[model samples]
Target: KTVRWCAVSEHEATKCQSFRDHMKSVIPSDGPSVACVKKASYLDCIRAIAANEADAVTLDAGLVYDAYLAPNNLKPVVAEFYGSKEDPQTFYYAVAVVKKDSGFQMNQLRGKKSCHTGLGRSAGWNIPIGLLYCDLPEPRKPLEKAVANFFSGSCAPCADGTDFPQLCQLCPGCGCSTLNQYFGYSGAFKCLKDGAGDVAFVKHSTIFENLANKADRDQYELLCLDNTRKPVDEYKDCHLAQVPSHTVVARSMGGKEDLIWELLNQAQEHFGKDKSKEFQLFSSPHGKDLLFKDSAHGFLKVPPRMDAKMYLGYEYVTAIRNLREGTCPEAPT
Candidate 1:
């Protein structure tokens, strides 16, 4: 059986292509085929599985757990850079952004609004929101709304019913915790620009407008969560935020799931090697859990769901969807 594996972020395509090429070289057997990634986003890959466009898909750990495996029936067969001392949970944190001076504390966001991608969507929305809604000091008030938005350059709607699983406080996974609803919308920046909601979640690396130019870093505020706060011993150089450590996920195998699992397991092992020394591992030591004391330069840790949900609770204290429709789901179960 042939499979098409995809990377969630367009920027990570180099790795995606490398994995695809390597898989073909290794599993070149009878009736065994592989497809170069089809310029699809992460959500599209999950939909591919659900709609039967592809047999198995690969993605970040958070996506595997939150979006596919948890929400649906998808299973994860492998994790990259595993067997390390670092556990999956307690990966580094990501920056949570809000309108400049929104006057919303991480504790007051109950019954407010927020912006994000779809539920169990990506690291940013999935793990981030999961941690916030499940953590936090008190039961967060439901977000009034959430906005789901997608990036600019990518395949349009997926073969599944979802629209690339846009980000918003409104989606089911995210909305139910602290939001009243979730709505679908356009891009992440646009949702923030329209003041569609009170809070939003985004990547810290996005501080650079693009790869070449410098962007204004002060356009928004990065919320600080209790768990996200760096320990006094480690605050010597960097700040803390909520970031999702990515992983690869596949569906459960009834009986014929051997080939796919083997391919994924080998692929992760292959990605663990550092040939050029240009990559930076974002897990453990740099992550909140401090699980990876050694090899602080290889891979980040993937968090357990219970811990991740707690992080979402903390974020919900300060999060709101930027768009009306894209942030939260209209009717969440």
Candidate 2:
């Protein structure tokens, strides 16, 4: 059999055809070869990996934290790096962007329509809520209730609309599913760009990568907690925090890590932007980052000895668990 490089879903499978074809062409068509298996969701892929039906997949830090816990034996094999080759980084900042003329500040976020990457995502939900609500008194109701009441409306994909309709109140799709057009990084930006949201919570590079020109880019501004605002490009000086990046994880047994790494290294060497423009490792014609972040420039090899906790760091891992467990970490008093 072959090592399956699991796609997150059918959408990814459809978009990944070209890359998969290219991979198979270069990788020998024999044992230990690269292959594809499309799962319905991240959890599904993780389960398949644990059950030995699949070998590996890339996941955000939040999901990696979940995979690190019970019922799974997957660990990170490589980390995605974003930015220029001169200064590649394993992390990026999460910032809240709004229309420059909206005259919105951090304090005014209450009662505003919002856009989010997804629930449990580092930039979109966990880090923002932790920073915003850490000092607030414990809610008498559910955390979703407090969040629902705070923002007039939001488009947080992957939230259970049946239980928390308010989270999907502004989403423009069939329920709170990944298929939603307003689900991930680019989708949240699209929500803000369409004026469906007053503020967009996404990664720092989202605007710059999406907006082609300086003039179009100037239309948006970032809202800082200090009550000041800055242009989109100035995220380094003004941002929430440098959150951890995504990881490619594999089953702990069978030497799958090295096999996957070999395939990825070969793919990047041949298809990477720096190597050739005919095809690229981190981009797709159908969607942003069909399998990897469109903005990623390279992969950083995670130490073979490292697990998700060590790879994601203590604070980052704790923040994700805290959010998943419905407990917000207490802000430094």
Candidate 3:
């Protein structure tokens, strides 16, 4: 009944909340009435489509594409929501975490332990892998287990607040840290301090600047890959990772597509053009430019394959080429 806006921020659902408010503010009062505001995770957004509980969500373009190929009938609305000024190499960068002073090698860490935020986050799982996938000038291994093992993937649930217990799960004797990406900073730092694991993903330079300012400082280093150490153009201080901008998807019944189009159009008016608030909306945004201005991984490009089987010559879902012929397939029931 109500429009649901799922995003990574619960404390700051204002980003999504603002969109609804803006729509109400801009749209004619007689427009479809506003219902309720809902906060959801990236996964929840996709599930909502399947269960008919959500309209759409704001998420990374790559993740959206993945969800689009599934059983749901959802599709990308050609509207942009977020963007960055940096190029791919300098703009869309993420931290490859290792323990503060651990001896673990980067190569060994591959397919090993990692820590990810929600799906669409800058430092989260998909962005890093997508960046890696784009860079590898060779055929890549499909993330079979990573994608299949949903519950235990980069994001594992825990009781809110502290991460002490999660860190304990990676302790030396238990040795679970090297298995996959798990826990946030609270847990990663705990395991590192306790010698449970050598590394865990941390936030970007903004978080780094805050941590550095706090002399209570641990001796952590911010590792970046640029040979020139180019400055991040937009934020200036922080180094960027190759990332796509977050796409806001508005899901609704067939009759409601017009409502979505109107809502997003209003969001673009208030957020992208107005910049009237901290969190605004955008439509038809270019993901690559938003994440990394000119970097290799900066913009939205068609995924290699929605399903790897497509690479092996499987003819299931309508091919991207079919869109040109106006022959897109309907969602699977």
Candidate 4:
């Protein structure tokens, strides 16, 4: 059985191809050979896997939520984690970042400019949006509509070119692809740093990565759920939500869960990061987060008992449900 990995771009496809050739020399020729299939985007990759056209794809946390909604559903078999092998935690804290003492707390962002990681990303979109949604004024609207109203202008890449024209005015390009310079975590943060946005919806680690000096990093504060603000380092207690890492998803039926784990296990043990000269399973020569996150230290096999929903956790799933179904639950304390 060929274990196919869907590649999102030409560069990623090239990396996947090299991996394919390298695996041939290291693994048993008779076992499942690694293969690369091309897809234009992650959502299409999710759809292809469900249609049985592809075998596996690494998806962001919120994308995992979408892959679950795909026909036949998908299961997360392997997780990419950033902590040390000893810690090996399979999650990260999502935070809303603002320049320190901006005079705006988490609950008072109405009509301010915002930056987001992407349309459906966990920290950048889903978690932050879901949590922000609860604070909208009465006569609430759908999540997207209410969000557009809350932020006079914002960058939620790939949100919608035709329907949300004014929404993307804060960043470059109408199309929601990577072509927009203000796309992922760094871009989202950059939008705020460069004065285009007042707040950036991104993960906790972004400020540290961009600002080298401790004092410069201190210039940013995290907006906590309680409406009070705290230093970026306090994200564990004050941020919006804790979301799972990127997951390797496959069709639940004949999902090839074990096969995917076996491949990742072997690859990580061999080529992961500094382990090999031939290739690195977790990084690339150019661009960040090619197939897997650049920061991921290792792979963790998901427990057999868990599915996509359980992996994302009840709170996040319920948050997404609340946002999508337009349930304007009363603002919490």
On lDDT, the leading prediction is 4
How do the residues 93-180 of candidate 1 rate in per-residue lDDT, one tens digit apiece?
Answer: 4555555556665555554555653443443454344444423222232321121221211111111224323322233232322232
Ranked by TM-score, top first? 4, 2, 3, 1
- Model 3 over residues 24-134: C-alpha lDDT tens digits? 766677664333334455666566654666665545544555556556545544234223534222223345444334443433343344444332333544334443332
Sliding window of 10 residues with minimal summed lDDT for model 2: 132-141
TM-score leader: 4
Residue range 194-220, candidate 2, lDDT tens digits? 998899999888998899999999988
Instruction: Write out the backbone clash pairs for model 2.
Output: none
Q: List runs of model 3 lying over 4 Å from the truth.
A: 1-55, 59-66, 73-93, 99-104, 110-183, 186-197, 206-210, 213-246, 250-262, 268-333
TM-score of each: 0.37, 0.61, 0.38, 0.68
User: Which model is ahead, 1 or 2, in terms of lDDT?
Assistant: 2
Better of 1 and 3 by TM-score: 3
Model 2 scores a C-alpha lDDT of 0.77
Looking at candidate 4, the ten consecutive residues that score lowest on lDDT are 136-145
What's the CA error at residue 97 for candidate 3, in Å?
Answer: 3.3
How far off is residue 54 in model 4, in Å? 3.4
What number of clashing residue pairs does each candidate have, in the order they appear?
87, 0, 34, 1
